[PDB]
């Protein structure tokens, strides 16, 4: 584990985890530190890509931080973690409930309106 | 000691004690020159690293300031020692104080009771 | 363990531990009765002693109560013993939180400010 | 040195320095404890005698007082003493410039008029 956060040539301060392997560094969790306490934002909200390669030719400075912003941080990426597996287990239900209350209502069905079910699911 | 601004690609200026040695170079408190007299920032308010390395191609200009800047800048460096300085007094007064009144506070207890702050400090 | 109620020449009831040995009597934990339900308060809230020696000519009549007032007695002094002991651990806390926080602020200094400071500590 | 807090058979809480021989007890600076903080009042206002002897058999309890009310006690006897010696100084002070501005003012006199003075001054 190794938190650092970065700036980069954009102009933002980037907090996440580092890797520096060959020049081109590796970031994982990655967030953007609004100026305003503290405010952090997902930096890429469109990809799902757990790491994100990016060349050492385009950030400015990469230094440690204080102690305070690490707790923030680490506070934040847990209660995110928690949020998403609350969500999880709630659409685990919603869908096991929607799929039982379905199946006790196409129990009680006639032949031809079976066949006809049959007929427009393969339309 | 060797004082010189510089401005930066993105656009703005860096006062501060400079190291030039292989093309990478070193600062140290640094502060962001606002142009508005003359208001100082601090460049890098999360990170507490004495110093910080940049890249000689990401600079634009180096050059040596004129003597009310150097001046200026000499006060408010010293003036952030100084309160820093008198915080800590003060912090270290505050928990010498809480620590000694707790400390009789806790004395006049009992023995059942001692064991119920044992058996809940444990938990 | 020995509960009786007692009337001072002065004209107040006071309710805790009593110790007969030798005509001078020893009090634990004792309490005004307050006529007003039932109201108790602290007999001598200015000492920190467990327990204080009276002179049997100086009161006027003992006599063990009834078991409400009994009761009402060791729920009181459960109560307090409980409340004495949250405070004892918000002060911890307090002092632990205080304590780190003025490390981790004393640790990023210059070693002429460091020596400014333990000269006026030591002053 | 030894403060113990004590209850008149009255109903008044004395603080002071206490001696206790043969059965009588000596009190030096004494103090009444007004319950409203803390405020303490002159014992006995009306006489200047350092140490004032009383009976054990009108005392009900003496017990050893908390570290707060030592503390207090000890801040105003300090301040006591301390405006009763800025009092003297002002007062001496005073005595001297009318002294001299009377000696002044007697020395341009006739010799009937300082026969006057001396007759009147006999009378
Ligand atoms: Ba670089
Ligand atoms: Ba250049
Ligand atoms: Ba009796
Ligand atoms: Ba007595």
Redo the contacts between chains.
């Keep these: 584990k190794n938190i650092k ?1 970065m ?1 980069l ?1 954009t ?1 933002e ?1 980037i907090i996440g985890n580092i890797s520096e392997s060959q020049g081109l560094i590796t970031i994982k969790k990655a967030f953007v ?1 609004i100026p305003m306490q503290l405010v952090l934002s997902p930096w890429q909200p469109y990809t799902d890509d757990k790491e994100i390669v990016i060349d050492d030719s385009e950030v ?2 990469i ?5 305070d ?1 690490i707790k923030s941080y680490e506070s934040h990426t847990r209660v995110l973690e928690n949020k998403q597996v609350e969500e999880i287990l709630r659409l685990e239900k919603e869908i096991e409930d929607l799929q039982r209350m379905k199946e006790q209502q196409e129990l009680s069905l006639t032949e031809a309106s079976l066949q006809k079910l049959q007929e427009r699911r393969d339309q």
């Design positions: 956060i700036r040539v102009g301060d530190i400015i400075t230094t440690s931080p204080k102690d912003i």
